[PDB]
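Need the bound structure for heme C, inputs here:
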Amino acid sequence: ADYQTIYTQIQARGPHITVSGEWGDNDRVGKPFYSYWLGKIGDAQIGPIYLGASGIAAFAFGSTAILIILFNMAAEVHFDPLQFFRQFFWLGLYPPKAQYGMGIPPLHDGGWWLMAGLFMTLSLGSWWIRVYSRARALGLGTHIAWNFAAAIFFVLCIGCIHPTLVGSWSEGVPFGIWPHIDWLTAFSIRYGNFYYCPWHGFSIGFAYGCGLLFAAHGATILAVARFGGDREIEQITDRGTAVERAALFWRWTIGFNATIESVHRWGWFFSLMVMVSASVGILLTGTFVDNWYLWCVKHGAAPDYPAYLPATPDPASLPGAPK
Amino acid sequence: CFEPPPATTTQTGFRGLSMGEVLHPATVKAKKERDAQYPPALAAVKAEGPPVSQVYKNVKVLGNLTEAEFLRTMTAITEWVSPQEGCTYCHDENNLASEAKYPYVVARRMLEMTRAINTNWTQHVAQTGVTCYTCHRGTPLPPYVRYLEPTLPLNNRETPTHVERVETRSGYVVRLAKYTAYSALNYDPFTMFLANDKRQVRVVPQTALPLVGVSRGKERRPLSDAYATFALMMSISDSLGTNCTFCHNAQTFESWGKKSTPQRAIAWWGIRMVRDLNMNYLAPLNASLPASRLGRQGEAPQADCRTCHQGVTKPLFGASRLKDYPELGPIK
Amino acid sequence: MYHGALAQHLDIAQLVWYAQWLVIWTVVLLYLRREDRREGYPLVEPLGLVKLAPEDGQVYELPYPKTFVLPHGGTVTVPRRRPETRELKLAQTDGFEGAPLQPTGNPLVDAVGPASYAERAEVVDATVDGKAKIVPLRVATDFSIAEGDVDPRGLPVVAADGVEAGTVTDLWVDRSEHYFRYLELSVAGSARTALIPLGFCDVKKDKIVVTSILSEQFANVPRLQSRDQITLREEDKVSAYYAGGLLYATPERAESLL
Amino acid sequence: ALLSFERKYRVRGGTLIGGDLFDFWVGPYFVGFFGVSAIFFIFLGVSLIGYAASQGPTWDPFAISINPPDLKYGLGAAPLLEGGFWQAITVCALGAFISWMLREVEISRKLGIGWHVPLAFCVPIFMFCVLQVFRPLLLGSWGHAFPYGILSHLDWVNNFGYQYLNWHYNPGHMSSVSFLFVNAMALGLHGGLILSVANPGDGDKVKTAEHENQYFRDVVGYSIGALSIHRLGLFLASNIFLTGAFGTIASGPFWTRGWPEWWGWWLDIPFWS
Ligand code: BCB
Ligand code: BCB
Ligand code: BCB
Ligand SMILES: C/C=C1/c2cc3[nH]c4c(c3C)C(=O)[C@H](C(=O)OC)c4c3nc(cc4[nH]c(cc(n2)[C@@H]1C)c(C(C)=O)c4C)[C@@H](C)[C@@H]3CCC(=O)OC/C=C(/C)CCC[C@H](C)CCC[C@H](C)CCCC(C)C
Ligand SMILES: C/C=C1/c2cc3[nH]c4c(c3C)C(=O)[C@H](C(=O)OC)c4c3nc(cc4[nH]c(cc(n2)[C@@H]1C)c(C(C)=O)c4C)[C@@H](C)[C@@H]3CCC(=O)OC/C=C(\C)CCC[C@H](C)CCC[C@H](C)CCCC(C)C
Ligand SMILES: CC(C)=CCC/C(C)=C/CC/C(C)=C/CC/C(C)=C/CC/C(C)=C/CC/C(C)=C/CC/C(C)=C/CC1=C(C)C(=O)c2ccccc2C1=O
Ligand code: HEC
Ligand code: HEC
Ligand code: HEC
Ligand code: HEC
Ligand SMILES: CC(C)=CCC/C(C)=C/C=C/C(C)=C/C=C/C(C)=C/C=C\C=C(C)\C=C\C=C(/C)CC/C=C(/C)CCCC(C)C
Ligand SMILES: CCCCCCCCCCCC[N+](C)(C)[O-]
Ligand SMILES: CCCCCCCCCCCC[N+](C)(C)[O-]
Ligand SMILES: CCCCCCCCCCCC[N+](C)(C)[O-]
Ligand SMILES: [Fe+3]
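Answer from helper R.:
Posting the output first, comments after.
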């Protein structure tokens, strides 16, 4: 076995490299330190950190959002610090419970929720241009930023675009561990079972394929570490036996293959498609489909099954039944 | 942390749909033993003499009965409701017609109520029926009742910790969670759905596309309604010791026909019956009860699914006394 | 009336369903699968002789060429004409088109099968600022072995047949990633140095186990042009040598494990 | 037929069984003995699919469903129409998957590369066994396994989940979902990074490993490095099932209540009850 794929046997230390960016080279802060155990499964060097305007903008807005959430959570346990730790996962900040439509809700019923939402959104925008601008300062493509943009767009969809399109803030995702989880069933129940939403299926298909691809890709590169396949940039510009063998492994297995560069396009596209497909689904939900199961029945897609115990007429539609 | 195998499983849907009951034998055995304490029926007595309407002085509900029949009823009522307290819980030792003690008048309406259950709600209690024991389980205060706010513990025979006490506000989220099978759902399904008939529990549309006129802005029910009925269903599932699959094929929660089981229909009638009982029998009893029985808003204790079922899909595993006590219903 | 309804049993979501599938297959078929063809294409046959004009499918499956402008001068354009010049000493086991080839000589030296190397550039991979990236510690003197790990310099190398085959004289490090990639070792009894990729190295505290090749086979490990740097092709030549051993070092390794 | 660089690798040997007898290609496909068993099991499998489907109501691909037996048949053979087909097809699937994996080790040996990929492919084969074999063994009927239908298998995932009131609270599930999400993220980040270095665009020049690590250090203060991101990727992906398996196996055999209630171990500690 090649033990180098499991962990680094002999770590190396050496002077810290700094690649100069078109700007902000002075805004890198902290002194690098090295971790020996980290260095067995990774790169040992932790830090420094770039610290631009946007990074701080993000921390500013995010902490505002986190504080708005935490104080509302604490208010839910009338500020008892011990019950706060005990009940933390059950505590949340909820959108309006009553129907105000698009009206700005009272603070005690989703106003605070709305404001945490604004400040998180601003934090995501700030972090986004950090992710983008860092790439141009170092003279790199904006690939990551576009993938990240899709992720942010999906959050906006479940957070406020979908509430806007149906016209009720009551449909936002709550903040909280279990509470954000509870929303998923409430939403799915309201809209007729998300298993019958094709864009759910697409999202899952790509999400699972990200599992398939990264397991497959990660395993492939490790299988060709002896020939240097981890040095992927120079294997793009000067094909070595590593990617030759990697390509022939797959070609002989599934009948076709990629290049060392294009597999990364595959992976980038699949991860992007998780969020693009999820977004289309939410945009269509509520606005143009009310019950995803009935929509599948309408179009002849739903499976059907014989009764096991006897079919049961809705009692509410028998004559003279109470309401 | 965990429960040791094996698990008893049942089937409630077509093969392949993973619908049925998943029960822990230990737990079922414990609940079976607890429910087996149901006292056996008293021996039958033969009807002799006049109706008790002409012998005793203050009998308005049970006047049809003869003396031996009637007294059999009274010792059964004592066995089911106040075994440890005895006849004197409802009566003055030296005036059995005195209504001076509040349990007397409540017991009178409880008689009318449980007779009503066994006559008007056969769509839910069927041939099994209910007796006083079904709810009371041998104490004057039934172990499982509800106020207009959630209380802990669910069994009022256990003593509350400081946080569990309703006046401790830091423990609200936990009081509420334990009513909804430990979920963080932020709704009290009892006051929303079981205390009265003001709210509809159905939330999911019966058309594929959104109907113009009910689908935008303030025309829309808020999403909270969906959370709320999820909560009610969690709470129902817990109260019967079962899961959604007992009643639903999750493929379409909103559909009946092949997508529902007969138990879902019975559960539907149970909602209606619990609403009748609360609105028309149990809630008005705040006039007749002492303040120590009322909740923090002057409400009497009311019933939910648990009051009868106590974690079993049939109360007391289907035990019945119906034919043994005709006086309790159904009445022609 | 219904939000999303269109004329005669159409609705918006039904159209988007069709649109989405179209978008997917467009990206997969017209874009990704062509990107997959930037290497190894056009394919080769039992001599495709049509030298006057190209066959239509070979033009359609290719993307428009792209050019990488390399960081230390140069450009590379893919796809391109890149045929294998070297004489491969292999022979056809049969006439069938996809029958395997047998090695005619000694497959480790002749560099066939798992011992094949790509025809990469005969240039030394460089750091971001121009220096030779993969250098041994005698040159990279500001690089150390980390506190806690075996220092292999001095330890013996034991080959697959339990025979001491040489002594580790040095470690070659990746100055761009801070990562040791080869050990240098003296080959006992032949007064030469040889590089081993660490991936073929079982690093113990008293020895370095190497199961890929036999002790005698350390003689013919490819030699470098220079003492203190290595080219990308040489790295391929060296790495491939040991990989060849996994299948060829003994007769029994090629035949069925059971 | 052959990639420009392919012919030098296309040598004999590296098989596990059969030596020369099955050591050859057909088009691009390596065969081997496990190629032959794969095709056998595939043929048998999709034959049994097609027979079973014709005895059913419809031919609409979305609505076909080959289902396991009723629970009453426990772990025995069931009539072919009422679960037998499902039993036969499951065996053919396992034959095909294991063949496919072993085919991959043979291809790996011939190229003289690591067996990491067939290794990685074991974990989805394992997870399939958790759902169709081990968990039905522990519960005692094949009828607890999932049906073979595009949409019908979702109805099984659905009801299975709701048998425990809110499956989201399953701690094995929480772990599994978290790996699914972060794995998808990391692949975006990894693929994004690689292309951003090789494709800055505008005629600007290709960058370098140093640029790779510099980018992540700058934005999040740490960069795990080239080789390690691949090791982490395989680790993250694999733990989707490796941890989720526990949450699946627990549900039923080791837990019959709802999954939210399981968190009583925390909520109901007396010290803060
Ligand atoms: C415990 C939970 C499970 C689950 C939960 C689940 C959900 C919630 C959803 C799916 C979905 C999907 N699942 Mg399912 N599933 C599937 C296959 C499928 C596909 C129909 C679809 C998308 C798959 C995908 O893109 O993956 C990534 C793999 C890729 C991208 C490579 C291409 C795969 C190719 C599309 C597979 C197609 C398979 C064929 C239709 C079946 C084989 C046909 C035969 C005759 C050769 C197989 C083959 C298995 C096996 C053998 O175990 C399986 C088990 C499970 N699924 C478990 C039961 N799955 C989605 C769907 O849309 O279904 C309607 C969906 O929403
Ligand atoms: C009972 C209810 C269910 C449900 C309800 C549900 C809903 C309501 C929605 C989904 C959605 C999705 N579901 Mg589904 N689901 C899925 C899988 C998925 C996902 C692939 C997909 C997209 C969500 C995502 O990846 O977000 C992970 C990524 C996120 C959330 C982006 C985060 C990026 C962000 C920039 C991160 C930044 C955070 C900050 C750093 C922190 C700051 C916060 C502080 C300040 C407070 C599987 C595999 C299954 C199975 C096996 O059963 C399943 C079943 C269910 N889902 C049941 C049917 N699901 C979504 C979808 O696709 O709908 C069409 C969706 O909207
Ligand atoms: C209402 C019910 C729900 C539910 C019920 C549920 C159950 C019951 C189980 C899961 C499981 C899982 N759920 Mg979950 N779920 C998930 C995500 C997930 C997955 C991460 C995880 C594993 C799925 C699996 O086992 O694949 C299985 C995939 C397999 C077996 C792949 C087989 C591949 C095979 C080897 C090869 C197949 C090849 C093809 C046939 C060949 C054909 C190809 C062509 C090209 C030739 C998300 C992200 C969400 C969201 C967003 O809400 C969600 C909500 C729900 N889940 C709802 C709450 N979920 C599983 C789990 O791990 O639980 C802890 C699980 O058992
Ligand atoms: C399919 C597509 C996937 C995807 C894709 C992508 N996702 C990306 C990118 C792409 C392309 C980025 O480039 C960006 C990034 O930067 O990566 C390094 C990023 C992000 N995705 C995060 C979280 C996330 N992605 C999720 C999901 C999906 N994403 C889906 C699955 C989920 C789920 C599943 O819920 C979560 C929770 C954050 C780490 C980050 C934003 C931080 C922020 O918006 O500021 C918010 C401001 C704060 C103050 C919060 C501080 C705490 C957080 C943890 C941040 C701490 C970092 C800090 C620098 C630590 C320093 C310590 C140091 C000294 C040692
Ligand atoms: C965390 C681990 C991840 C992971 C990892 C890896 N995944 C790998 C590898 C690794 C490493 C490979 O090396 C291998 C491969 O070669 O890559 C191209 C592979 C593969 N992953 C496939 C499918 C896949 N991966 C999934 C998931 C994950 N993978 C998770 C995420 C999922 C889902 C559902 O998520 C699917 C559907 C095939 C494409 C391929 C097998 C081909 C095969 O096996 O050929 C042999 C079999 C056939 C060609 C068909 C056989 C038909 C049978 C006999 C009859 C049908 C019965 C069937 C049960 C009916 C079901 C009906 C259905 C509607 C319910
Ligand atoms: C007819 C007959 C008797 C034949 C005999 C021979 C025989 C056994 C034939 C088998 C026939 C069969 C069953 C064929 C089916 C083939 C199969 C299973 C195809 C499935 C293909 C699918 C859907 C894959 C999903 C994954 C996916 C999206 C891949 C796209 C990108 C690719 C090709 C990734 C593979 C790949 C990865 C993962 C790298 O990391 C890598 C690194 C460097 C260079 C190349 C690569 C590379 O190609
Ligand atoms: C409350 C739960 C009661 C217990 C315990 C006992 N009795 Fe009772 N009794 C109760 C009510 C509400 C009534 C009125 C019945 C009606 O139909 O309106 C009665 C009535 C009697 C009578 C009739 C006397 C009269 O009103 O003239 C008798 C003789 C009587 N009860 C006796 C009795 C005995 C012996 C009991 C212990 C075995 C006993 N009762 C318990 C309410 C309750
Ligand atoms: C559930 C559907 C019940 C059935 C059947 C019967 N009772 Fe009941 N009872 C029930 C509740 C929820 C309450 C309120 C809690 C309380 O303690 O008041 C009661 C109350 C009584 C009382 C008053 C006891 C007291 O407050 O100390 C009595 C005397 C009583 N109930 C008697 C009684 C009898 C005799 C019944 C059968 C004829 C009977 N109850 C049925 C719930 C339910
Ligand atoms: C039987 C004892 C049930 C169990 C267990 C669960 N549900 Fe239920 N549900 C039941 C009934 C009788 C009804 C109709 C109530 C009425 O008054 O009309 C419902 C309703 C729902 C709905 C709403 C469907 C609609 O038409 O809007 C949902 C979404 C629902 N139920 C979900 C659900 C879940 C998730 C359960 C397990 C937690 C569950 N139910 C259990 C009866 C019974
Ligand atoms: C006492 C007045 C009850 C209350 C309150 C509720 N239920 Fe009930 N239920 C009761 C009886 C006596 C029976 C008869 C058992 C029999 O053999 O039929 C039932 C039955 C059910 C069932 C049928 C279960 C089965 O296995 O067939 C269900 C599903 C049920 N009950 C549900 C239910 C719900 C949801 C309730 C609160 C709304 C509820 N019941 C209250 C007595 C009483
Ligand atoms: C016109 C104006 C007024 C209205 C528009 C405002 C606007 C754009 C609102 C947008 C709102 C949006 C996008 C809301 C989306 C909310 C979502 C998706 C919430 C989802 C999950 C929230 C979770 C998990 C939060 C949990 C909170 C906590 C754990 C406490 C906070 C503390 C932390 C340390 C956070 C850690 C989170 C995690 C990494 C562990
Ligand atoms: C995961 C859910 C996938 C459901 C697939 C249903 C697609 C319905 C669209 C079918 C095409 C329209 N038409 C005309 C054929 O009915
Ligand atoms: C449900 C998600 C859909 C994902 C689509 C990914 C399918 C990849 C198809 C590979 C096609 C191979 N080939 C050679 C035929 O082009
Ligand atoms: C229409 C749905 C199709 C789902 C995606 C199927 C993936 C196709 C892979 C089969 C191609 C095999 N081949 C020819 C490339 O060897
Ligand atoms: Fe990579």
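Comments: Chain D is about 60% helix and 0% strand. Residues 166-273 of chain D form one domain.
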